[PDB]
Short mmCIF file of C-alpha atoms and ligand atoms in Angstrom, two decimals:
data_model
loop_
_atom_site.label_atom_id
_atom_site.label_comp_id
_atom_site.label_asym_id
_atom_site.label_seq_id
_atom_site.Cartn_x
_atom_site.Cartn_y
_atom_site.Cartn_z
CA UNK A 1 81.16 -23.89 -13.05
CA UNK A 2 83.74 -21.59 -13.60
CA UNK A 3 84.01 -19.02 -10.68
CA UNK A 4 83.77 -15.20 -12.15
CA UNK A 5 85.95 -12.36 -10.37
CA UNK A 6 86.28 -8.76 -10.52
CA UNK A 7 90.29 -8.47 -9.78
CA UNK A 8 91.86 -6.45 -12.27
CA UNK A 9 95.13 -7.60 -11.99
CA UNK A 10 97.04 -5.05 -14.12
CA UNK A 11 95.25 -2.06 -11.51
CA UNK A 12 97.46 0.18 -9.69
CA UNK A 13 95.85 -0.89 -6.42
CA UNK A 14 96.50 -4.87 -6.83
CA UNK A 15 100.29 -3.68 -7.89
CA UNK A 16 100.81 -2.52 -4.15
CA UNK A 17 100.08 -5.50 -3.00
CA UNK A 18 99.14 -8.35 -4.70
CA UNK A 19 99.45 -11.19 -2.37
CA UNK A 20 95.45 -11.03 -1.02
CA UNK A 21 94.18 -11.03 -4.00
CA UNK A 22 96.63 -14.07 -5.61
CA UNK A 23 95.20 -15.85 -2.79
CA UNK A 24 91.86 -15.46 -3.12
CA UNK A 25 92.53 -16.33 -7.10
CA UNK A 26 93.99 -19.75 -6.17
CA UNK A 27 91.24 -20.42 -3.37
CA UNK A 28 88.79 -19.55 -6.25
CA UNK A 29 89.51 -22.35 -8.08
CA UNK A 30 92.20 -24.38 -9.89
CA UNK A 31 90.65 -21.94 -12.94
CA UNK A 32 88.53 -18.76 -12.85
CA UNK A 33 87.47 -16.10 -15.61
CA UNK A 34 88.20 -12.22 -15.19
CA UNK A 35 85.43 -10.38 -15.82
CA UNK A 36 87.69 -7.21 -16.60
CA UNK A 37 89.67 -8.21 -19.44
CA UNK A 38 87.66 -11.57 -20.54
CA UNK A 39 90.73 -14.16 -20.25
CA UNK A 40 90.96 -17.07 -17.87
CA UNK A 41 92.98 -16.70 -14.78
CA UNK A 42 95.63 -19.27 -13.41
CA UNK A 43 97.43 -19.26 -9.79
CA UNK A 44 98.20 -22.26 -8.46
CA UNK A 45 101.50 -23.73 -9.26
CA UNK A 46 99.91 -26.70 -10.73
CA UNK A 47 98.42 -25.37 -13.37
CA UNK A 48 100.33 -22.69 -13.85
CA UNK A 49 103.26 -25.35 -14.88
CA UNK A 50 100.62 -27.88 -17.10
CA UNK A 51 99.77 -24.64 -18.58
CA UNK A 52 103.36 -23.47 -19.21
CA UNK A 53 104.63 -27.59 -20.50
CA UNK A 54 101.75 -27.68 -23.00
CA UNK A 55 103.14 -24.91 -25.42
CA UNK A 56 100.80 -27.35 -28.44
CA UNK A 57 97.24 -26.00 -26.66
CA UNK A 58 98.62 -23.08 -25.07
CA UNK A 59 100.86 -21.48 -27.62
CA UNK A 60 102.53 -18.32 -27.68
CA UNK A 61 102.35 -17.26 -31.87
CA UNK A 62 98.98 -15.74 -30.74
CA UNK A 63 100.88 -12.45 -28.06
CA UNK A 64 102.51 -13.73 -24.90
CA UNK A 65 100.01 -10.49 -23.81
CA UNK A 66 96.63 -10.10 -23.38
CA UNK A 67 96.10 -9.10 -27.27
CA UNK A 68 95.52 -11.69 -29.79
CA UNK A 69 97.51 -11.64 -32.54
CA UNK A 70 95.32 -13.09 -34.67
CA UNK A 71 92.31 -10.00 -34.12
CA UNK A 72 94.97 -7.17 -33.35
CA UNK A 73 98.12 -5.55 -34.61
CA UNK A 74 101.43 -6.29 -32.69
CA UNK A 75 101.99 -2.54 -30.89
CA UNK A 76 106.49 -4.04 -32.92
CA UNK A 77 107.62 -6.82 -35.31
CA UNK A 78 106.90 -10.43 -33.26
CA UNK A 79 109.37 -11.87 -31.59
CA UNK A 80 111.49 -14.59 -33.35
CA UNK A 81 111.94 -16.41 -29.85
CA UNK A 82 108.99 -15.36 -27.38
CA UNK A 83 106.24 -14.47 -29.34
CA UNK A 84 106.97 -17.78 -31.93
CA UNK A 85 106.08 -21.38 -31.44
CA UNK A 86 107.90 -24.90 -32.71
CA UNK A 87 109.12 -25.34 -34.50
CA UNK A 88 110.25 -21.92 -36.12
CA UNK A 89 110.74 -21.33 -32.12
CA UNK A 90 113.12 -24.06 -32.02
CA UNK A 91 116.21 -22.67 -34.14
CA UNK A 92 116.22 -19.45 -32.96
CA UNK A 93 116.41 -19.91 -29.48
CA UNK A 94 118.97 -23.00 -30.03
CA UNK A 95 120.95 -19.80 -31.29
CA UNK A 96 120.30 -17.69 -28.02
CA UNK A 97 121.25 -20.42 -26.25
CA UNK A 98 124.19 -20.70 -27.66
CA UNK A 99 125.07 -17.04 -26.97
CA UNK A 100 124.34 -16.75 -23.31
CA UNK A 101 125.58 -20.35 -23.02
CA UNK A 102 126.94 -22.07 -20.25
CA UNK A 103 130.66 -21.14 -22.07
CA UNK A 104 130.09 -18.17 -22.45
CA UNK A 105 129.04 -17.17 -18.68
CA UNK A 106 133.32 -18.58 -18.91
CA UNK A 107 134.45 -15.31 -20.78
CA UNK A 108 132.45 -12.66 -18.35
CA UNK A 109 132.46 -14.09 -15.08
CA UNK A 110 135.60 -12.39 -14.05
CA UNK A 111 134.57 -8.77 -15.26
CA UNK A 112 131.13 -8.95 -14.23
CA UNK A 113 132.24 -10.34 -10.15
CA UNK A 114 135.17 -7.19 -10.40
CA UNK A 115 132.03 -4.70 -11.23
CA UNK A 116 130.03 -6.25 -7.91
CA UNK A 117 133.13 -5.57 -5.55
CA UNK A 118 133.54 -2.96 -7.32
CA UNK A 119 130.09 -0.90 -7.30
CA UNK A 120 129.67 -2.41 -3.31
CA UNK A 121 132.95 -0.26 -2.36
CA UNK A 122 131.90 2.34 -4.10
CA UNK A 123 128.59 2.57 -2.60
CA UNK A 124 130.19 1.62 1.31
CA UNK A 125 132.13 5.05 0.83
CA UNK A 126 128.54 6.63 0.77
CA UNK A 127 126.77 5.24 3.97
CA UNK A 128 123.51 5.93 2.75
CA UNK A 129 122.42 4.91 -1.28
CA UNK A 130 119.47 4.13 -3.03
CA UNK A 131 119.72 0.53 -3.53
CA UNK A 132 117.52 0.79 -7.10
CA UNK A 133 118.63 3.50 -8.69
CA UNK A 134 122.55 3.54 -7.11
CA UNK A 135 123.29 -0.56 -7.15
CA UNK A 136 120.12 -2.47 -8.70
CA UNK A 137 120.00 -0.48 -11.83
CA UNK A 138 123.70 0.65 -11.33
CA UNK A 139 125.25 -2.58 -11.55
CA UNK A 140 123.55 -3.94 -14.56
CA UNK A 141 124.02 -1.23 -16.77
CA UNK A 142 127.37 -1.51 -16.02
CA UNK A 143 128.25 -4.75 -16.61
CA UNK A 144 125.20 -5.71 -19.35
CA UNK A 145 125.81 -3.36 -22.53
CA UNK A 146 129.27 -3.42 -22.86
CA UNK A 147 128.41 -7.09 -22.48
CA UNK A 148 125.72 -6.44 -25.63
CA UNK A 149 128.70 -5.07 -27.42
CA UNK A 150 126.63 -1.29 -27.57
CA UNK A 151 128.37 1.79 -28.00
CA UNK A 152 128.08 4.22 -25.33
CA UNK A 153 125.34 7.11 -26.73
CA UNK A 154 122.27 6.39 -26.05
CA UNK A 155 122.29 3.75 -23.43
CA UNK A 156 119.58 6.07 -21.43
CA UNK A 157 117.12 4.90 -24.35
CA UNK A 158 117.18 0.79 -22.33
CA UNK A 159 115.15 1.48 -19.39
CA UNK A 160 112.68 3.04 -21.50
CA UNK A 161 112.11 0.63 -23.75
CA UNK A 162 113.07 -2.33 -21.58
CA UNK A 163 109.70 -0.71 -19.30
CA UNK A 164 107.83 -0.08 -22.72
CA UNK A 165 108.20 -3.62 -23.91
CA UNK A 166 106.65 -5.41 -20.30
CA UNK A 167 103.88 -2.18 -20.10
CA UNK A 168 102.55 -3.35 -23.88
CA UNK A 169 102.08 -6.66 -22.47
CA UNK A 170 99.09 -5.56 -20.13
CA UNK A 171 95.79 -4.71 -21.20
CA UNK A 172 94.92 -1.65 -23.51
CA UNK A 173 95.20 0.49 -19.94
CA UNK A 174 96.69 3.78 -18.98
CA UNK A 175 100.29 2.40 -18.54
CA UNK A 176 100.26 0.90 -21.74
CA UNK A 177 98.96 3.74 -23.61
CA UNK A 178 101.31 6.12 -22.52
CA UNK A 179 104.56 4.19 -22.41
CA UNK A 180 103.63 3.42 -26.57
CA UNK A 181 102.84 7.06 -27.05
CA UNK A 182 106.81 7.48 -26.01
CA UNK A 183 107.92 5.14 -27.45
CA UNK A 184 109.24 6.40 -31.06
CA UNK A 185 112.59 7.79 -29.82
CA UNK A 186 113.58 4.38 -27.71
CA UNK A 187 111.91 1.70 -30.74
CA UNK A 188 114.20 3.82 -32.71
CA UNK A 189 117.53 3.79 -31.28
CA UNK A 190 117.10 -0.09 -30.27
CA UNK A 191 116.20 -1.32 -34.15
CA UNK A 192 119.60 0.91 -34.80
CA UNK A 193 122.02 -1.03 -32.53
CA UNK A 194 121.02 -4.31 -33.82
CA UNK A 195 122.47 -4.61 -37.32
CA UNK A 196 125.53 -5.68 -37.43
CA UNK A 197 128.20 -2.77 -37.97
CA UNK A 198 126.99 -1.38 -34.52
CA UNK A 199 127.84 -4.46 -32.12
CA UNK A 200 131.22 -4.16 -30.97
CA UNK A 201 133.36 -7.33 -32.13
CA UNK A 202 132.52 -10.55 -28.87
CA UNK A 203 129.96 -9.41 -27.79
CA UNK A 204 126.71 -11.31 -27.45
CA UNK A 205 124.99 -8.89 -30.70
CA UNK A 206 127.89 -9.73 -32.24
CA UNK A 207 127.95 -13.27 -31.46
CA UNK A 208 124.58 -13.57 -32.56
CA UNK A 209 125.07 -12.76 -36.39
CA UNK A 210 128.34 -14.41 -36.23
CA UNK A 211 125.49 -17.50 -36.01
CA UNK A 212 123.69 -16.78 -39.49
CA UNK A 213 126.36 -18.88 -41.38
CA UNK A 214 125.14 -22.50 -39.63
CA UNK A 215 121.51 -22.38 -41.66
CA UNK A 216 120.23 -21.71 -38.09
CA UNK A 217 118.97 -18.47 -38.59
CA UNK A 218 119.43 -16.49 -41.83
CA UNK A 219 121.11 -12.59 -41.76
CA UNK A 220 117.88 -11.16 -41.47
CA UNK A 221 116.92 -13.22 -38.59
CA UNK A 222 119.68 -11.58 -36.86
CA UNK A 223 118.65 -7.79 -36.05
CA UNK A 224 115.61 -9.05 -34.38
CA UNK A 225 117.12 -11.80 -31.81
CA UNK A 226 119.73 -8.70 -30.98
CA UNK A 227 116.21 -7.21 -29.85
CA UNK A 228 115.21 -9.60 -27.96
CA UNK A 229 118.29 -9.43 -25.53
CA UNK A 230 117.96 -5.58 -25.78
CA UNK A 231 113.81 -6.01 -24.72
CA UNK A 232 114.37 -8.73 -22.00
CA UNK A 233 116.93 -9.17 -19.42
CA UNK A 234 117.59 -5.53 -17.65
CA UNK A 235 114.65 -4.90 -15.93
CA UNK A 236 113.83 -8.39 -14.55
CA UNK A 237 117.47 -8.52 -13.31
CA UNK A 238 117.34 -4.77 -11.63
CA UNK A 239 113.74 -6.28 -9.84
CA UNK A 240 115.27 -9.26 -9.14
CA UNK A 241 118.95 -7.35 -7.91
CA UNK A 242 116.41 -4.49 -5.64
CA UNK A 243 114.13 -7.91 -4.16
CA UNK A 244 116.83 -10.09 -3.17
CA UNK A 245 118.46 -6.46 -1.20
CA UNK A 246 115.38 -5.28 0.13
CA UNK A 247 114.89 -9.13 1.71
CA UNK A 248 118.01 -9.11 3.13
CA UNK A 249 117.24 -5.87 4.54
CA UNK A 250 113.43 -6.93 5.79
CA UNK A 251 115.27 -10.23 6.71
CA UNK A 252 118.63 -9.41 8.95
CA UNK A 253 118.46 -12.59 10.49
CA UNK A 254 119.05 -14.13 6.59
CA UNK A 255 122.22 -11.85 5.99
CA UNK A 256 123.98 -13.04 8.27
CA UNK A 257 123.53 -16.32 6.61
CA UNK A 258 124.58 -15.12 3.84
CA UNK A 259 127.51 -13.71 5.44
CA UNK A 260 129.11 -16.14 6.79
CA UNK A 261 128.18 -18.49 3.99
CA UNK A 262 128.64 -16.90 1.32
CA UNK A 263 128.94 -19.51 -1.35
CA UNK A 264 124.94 -19.31 -0.66
CA UNK A 265 124.59 -16.10 -3.00
CA UNK A 266 123.58 -17.85 -5.96
CA UNK A 267 120.53 -19.48 -3.81
CA UNK A 268 120.35 -16.06 -2.08
CA UNK A 269 119.60 -14.76 -5.49
CA UNK A 270 117.59 -17.79 -7.02
CA UNK A 271 115.15 -17.70 -3.92
CA UNK A 272 114.64 -13.92 -4.27
CA UNK A 273 113.45 -14.39 -8.07
CA UNK A 274 110.82 -16.98 -6.34
CA UNK A 275 110.22 -14.42 -3.66
CA UNK A 276 110.21 -11.33 -5.22
CA UNK A 277 108.86 -13.33 -9.50
CA UNK A 278 110.13 -9.98 -11.76
CA UNK A 279 108.15 -10.98 -14.26
CA UNK A 280 104.23 -11.56 -12.32
CA UNK A 281 102.25 -12.66 -14.90
CA UNK A 282 101.79 -13.47 -18.93
CA UNK A 283 99.62 -15.15 -21.55
CA UNK A 284 99.00 -18.40 -23.63
CA UNK A 285 96.24 -19.00 -26.27
CA UNK A 286 94.08 -21.67 -26.65
CA UNK A 287 94.79 -23.18 -29.44
CA UNK A 288 91.68 -25.91 -29.22
CA UNK A 289 89.39 -27.16 -26.68
CA UNK A 290 90.97 -27.80 -23.74
CA UNK A 291 90.24 -29.13 -20.26
CA UNK A 292 91.96 -27.67 -17.66
CA UNK A 293 91.46 -27.89 -13.65
CA UNK A 294 87.63 -29.61 -14.46
CA UNK A 295 87.25 -26.68 -16.76
CA UNK A 296 86.60 -26.52 -20.62
CA UNK A 297 88.62 -23.59 -22.18
CA UNK A 298 86.74 -22.90 -25.92
CA UNK A 299 89.97 -23.02 -28.94
CA UNK A 300 91.30 -18.98 -29.05
CA UNK A 301 90.88 -17.97 -25.40
CA UNK A 302 94.25 -15.89 -23.45
CA UNK A 303 94.52 -17.60 -20.52
CA UNK A 304 96.39 -15.21 -17.37
CA UNK A 305 99.11 -17.24 -15.75
CA UNK A 306 100.36 -15.85 -12.00
CA UNK A 307 103.53 -16.65 -11.90
CA UNK A 308 104.60 -14.82 -8.83
CA UNK A 309 101.31 -16.50 -7.42
CA UNK A 310 102.66 -20.12 -8.62
CA UNK A 311 105.80 -19.35 -6.15
CA UNK A 312 103.88 -18.75 -3.67
CA UNK A 313 101.45 -21.48 -3.94
CA UNK A 314 101.37 -22.94 -0.03
CA UNK A 315 100.24 -26.25 -2.02
CA UNK A 316 103.52 -26.45 -3.88
CA UNK A 317 105.66 -24.24 -0.78
CA UNK A 318 106.28 -25.16 2.89
CA UNK A 319 106.27 -21.17 4.10
CA UNK A 320 105.55 -19.50 0.84
CA UNK A 321 106.18 -15.27 2.30
CA UNK A 322 109.25 -16.34 4.07
CA UNK A 323 112.26 -15.81 2.37
CA UNK A 324 115.04 -18.68 3.33
CA UNK A 325 118.11 -18.69 1.45
CA UNK A 326 118.71 -22.01 1.90
CA UNK A 327 115.72 -23.46 0.19
CA UNK A 328 115.67 -26.11 -2.07
CA UNK A 329 113.90 -23.30 -4.97
CA UNK A 330 114.31 -25.86 -7.80
CA UNK A 331 110.67 -26.24 -9.76
CA UNK A 332 109.79 -22.26 -9.08
CA UNK A 333 108.80 -20.46 -11.89
CA UNK A 334 110.09 -17.41 -12.63
CA UNK A 335 112.00 -18.03 -15.07
CA UNK A 336 109.02 -20.39 -16.67
CA UNK A 337 108.86 -23.75 -17.29
CA UNK A 338 109.46 -25.75 -20.73
CA UNK A 339 110.28 -24.89 -23.70
CA UNK A 340 110.70 -21.25 -23.39
CA UNK A 341 112.33 -21.19 -19.99
CA UNK A 342 114.39 -18.49 -19.80
CA UNK A 343 117.03 -18.43 -22.19
CA UNK A 344 118.91 -15.67 -20.01
CA UNK A 345 118.46 -17.03 -16.94
CA UNK A 346 122.57 -17.66 -16.94
CA UNK A 347 123.08 -14.61 -17.12
CA UNK A 348 120.75 -13.14 -14.45
CA UNK A 349 122.16 -15.97 -12.30
CA UNK A 350 125.54 -14.33 -12.60
CA UNK A 351 125.00 -11.08 -12.47
CA UNK A 352 122.77 -11.79 -9.16
CA UNK A 353 125.34 -14.10 -8.02
CA UNK A 354 128.70 -12.38 -7.80
CA UNK A 355 126.24 -8.81 -6.85
CA UNK A 356 125.25 -10.96 -3.61
CA UNK A 357 128.83 -12.20 -2.65
CA UNK A 358 130.08 -8.91 -2.67
CA UNK A 359 127.27 -7.39 -0.58
CA UNK A 360 127.95 -10.73 1.55
CA UNK A 361 131.89 -10.42 1.96
CA UNK A 362 131.75 -6.78 2.27
CA UNK A 363 128.77 -5.40 4.05
CA UNK A 364 127.86 -5.88 7.61
CA UNK A 365 124.18 -4.71 7.73
CA UNK A 366 121.60 -3.19 6.02
CA UNK A 367 119.08 -0.63 6.88
CA UNK A 368 115.72 0.88 5.35
CA UNK A 369 116.53 4.56 6.10
CA UNK A 370 113.87 6.29 3.79
CA UNK A 371 110.43 5.73 2.29
CA UNK A 372 110.28 3.20 0.19
CA UNK A 373 108.49 3.22 -3.40
CA UNK A 374 106.79 1.11 -5.71
CA UNK A 375 107.23 0.76 -9.57
CA UNK A 376 104.48 -0.05 -11.55
CA UNK A 377 104.19 -2.35 -14.32
CA UNK A 378 101.89 -4.30 -16.18
CA UNK A 379 104.14 -7.19 -16.09
CA UNK A 380 106.98 -6.54 -13.66
CA UNK A 381 107.09 -6.23 -10.23
CA UNK A 382 109.61 -4.43 -8.05
CA UNK A 383 110.58 -0.60 -6.51
CA UNK A 384 111.43 2.45 -7.57
CA UNK A 385 113.47 4.25 -4.42
CA UNK A 386 114.91 1.54 -2.03
CA UNK A 387 116.48 4.07 0.81
CA UNK A 388 119.45 2.00 2.54
CA UNK A 389 122.80 2.54 4.98
CA UNK A 390 125.33 -0.09 3.83
CA UNK A 391 127.40 -0.85 7.24
CA UNK A 392 131.11 -1.78 6.24
CA UNK A 393 132.11 -5.40 7.64
C1 HEM B 401 116.14 -12.71 -12.42
C2 HEM B 401 116.54 -12.38 -14.21
C3 HEM B 401 115.01 -12.85 -15.30
C4 HEM B 401 113.83 -13.32 -15.14
C5 HEM B 401 113.26 -13.54 -14.03
C6 HEM B 401 112.89 -14.02 -16.17
C7 HEM B 401 111.63 -14.03 -16.55
C8 HEM B 401 111.79 -14.63 -17.84
C9 HEM B 401 110.41 -15.76 -18.23
C10 HEM B 401 109.58 -15.78 -17.08
C11 HEM B 401 110.35 -15.46 -19.32
C12 HEM B 401 109.39 -16.99 -20.04
C13 HEM B 401 108.53 -16.56 -20.65
C14 HEM B 401 107.12 -17.30 -21.40
O1 HEM B 401 106.73 -18.27 -21.15
O2 HEM B 401 106.64 -16.84 -22.59
C15 HEM B 401 111.74 -15.42 -20.12
C16 HEM B 401 112.02 -15.85 -21.19
C17 HEM B 401 112.95 -15.31 -21.75
N1 HEM B 401 113.77 -14.12 -21.12
FE1 HEM B 401 114.31 -14.02 -19.68
N2 HEM B 401 114.72 -13.46 -17.65
C18 HEM B 401 115.00 -13.05 -16.99
C19 HEM B 401 116.57 -12.64 -16.96
C20 HEM B 401 116.94 -12.67 -18.26
C21 HEM B 401 118.45 -11.92 -18.88
C22 HEM B 401 119.65 -12.14 -18.32
C23 HEM B 401 118.02 -12.59 -20.45
C24 HEM B 401 119.28 -11.91 -21.29
C25 HEM B 401 120.17 -11.60 -21.42
C26 HEM B 401 116.59 -12.83 -20.78
C27 HEM B 401 115.77 -12.77 -22.11
C28 HEM B 401 115.22 -14.09 -22.31
C29 HEM B 401 114.42 -14.03 -23.56
C30 HEM B 401 115.29 -14.15 -25.15
C31 HEM B 401 113.26 -15.00 -23.38
C32 HEM B 401 112.50 -15.99 -24.39
C33 HEM B 401 112.97 -17.27 -24.36
C34 HEM B 401 112.22 -18.25 -25.15
O3 HEM B 401 110.82 -17.85 -25.76
O4 HEM B 401 112.01 -19.33 -25.83
N3 HEM B 401 116.06 -12.46 -19.28
N4 HEM B 401 112.53 -14.62 -19.05
O1 IRJ B 402 111.14 -9.64 -26.85
C1 IRJ B 402 112.11 -10.64 -26.81
O2 IRJ B 402 111.49 -11.36 -27.55
C2 IRJ B 402 111.52 -11.01 -24.94
C3 IRJ B 402 111.18 -9.64 -24.65
C4 IRJ B 402 110.53 -9.89 -23.36
C5 IRJ B 402 110.96 -11.38 -22.68
C6 IRJ B 402 110.67 -10.90 -20.89
C7 IRJ B 402 109.60 -12.08 -21.04
C8 IRJ B 402 108.14 -11.32 -21.44
C9 IRJ B 402 107.10 -12.03 -21.03
C10 IRJ B 402 106.23 -12.98 -19.87
C11 IRJ B 402 108.28 -13.09 -19.38
C12 IRJ B 402 108.98 -12.89 -19.81
C13 IRJ B 402 111.33 -12.70 -23.17
C14 IRJ B 402 111.83 -12.33 -24.62
CL1 CL B 403 111.28 -1.75 -31.60
#
């Protein structure tokens, strides 16, 4: 009843161009079986959304990667929020929801916006830049580690550790094995910065430790919660920003619309998150026999969700392959959906908005003027290099 496909969604061929195989996965049926890794797959919006919003049946505590924590040892101590189910997930989630809250965004928005304007002004003096290294990577690195309260030394570990985390969600392929092989120095840095004395007052990390006297988390839980904010947030925001720049370069009519109304900056970034989906895939594990899409999935089975495919499903989106900064993007699963829906989404939207705002006000044209190179990751989609010429407005 369930079609079996040999598509490897973690192969370099798939990463280079996933969209034809994603239609093949969508059109084969609501539920497929991937023989390469012995997992179930769902690539349509309806089933991805249904799985995300049933955390009791499709749990996260057995891992959101390929590895089943009931069968294998996690490569690092499990996250207290990402790899936890209700009710254990609830109170750590509440703390992070209060640390990265709407009220907290008010305290950081002016400095985030000023740094975005300053970076665009700096890049416009150079003219020809790499929109990945010099913009998509440089800007988050210029605001987020300071907002965390991290010291200056050792920040070069942040990008490798982020890429390692997302590669480790993948299958035991070469990308995952080499990442873990080189991981020891990055883990040692990250774990040490999670201790309370190493987090500057007023920052995100110090605020997490401050919640330890409320009864929501204990002091021994705070280091691992800080680790969450040093694992997530960087690479996805970098890829989302680089994707927005790539789209404004490939779709010049949308840059012109954004220039004419810079208040479209926030939705322009949200559409880039849907269009690119920096987090392409992750897993759930069934806790019981479940009926999904006419399929009887047994207990203890890994289910692979294709977030980027769900965000391009023509059953849900009109013209899904078009970048439209005025599209009604509400309902996209680029940040997930349900109880685990990205708790840092306000930080990501703030960074993306103020960067696209600076571009909208200061830049007249964005033209690719060099070879575009893709960055390969088991979980993340994004570019490695995006040579562009920025024309001042
Ligand atoms: C464009 C930027 C981002 C994207 C596309 C993204 C994507 C996602 C997705 C899809 C999930 C759901 C995970 C799941 O359901 O298993 C998630 C969760 C999470 N994200 Fe993000 N994220 C982004 C930015 C950030 C930022 C800026 C932060 C922190 C400052 C962050 C921290 C987290 C955390 C801690 C979780 C776990 C939440 C939970 O399990 O309840 N993310 N993210
Ligand atoms: O260490 C953590 O708690 C943590 C790490 C990464 C992420 C981002 C993500 C991971 C897998 C699937 C979708 C998104 C969230 C939380
Ligand atoms: Cl670690």
